[PDB]
Design a protein around this ligand. Structure first.
Ligand SMILES: [Zn+2]
Ligand SMILES: [Zn+2]
Length: 44
DNA sequence: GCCAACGTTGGC
DNA sequence: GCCAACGTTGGC
């Protein structure tokens, strides 16, 4: 089962998208979360 | 059925 | 080894 965001790290507390990062810019094709919101624990 | 975004992988 | 496209799926 796919892992879940931790809710606690600084990225998880962010509430809105930066709209300036690659992930935000390519969302339609890339399907990724804003780079500034990606959970610290889901990178490792 | 929609939607946000994780897992896999493939291009670099 | 990074990172983004694609496929997918959990929650609604
Ligand atoms: Zn962003
Ligand atoms: Zn987190």
């Amino acid at each position: 089962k796919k892992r879940k965001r931790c809710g606690m790290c600084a990225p998880c507390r962010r509430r809105i998208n930066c709209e300036q990062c690659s992930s935000c810019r390519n969302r339609k094709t890339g399907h990724q979360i804003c780079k500034f919101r990606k959970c610290e624990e889901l990178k490792k």
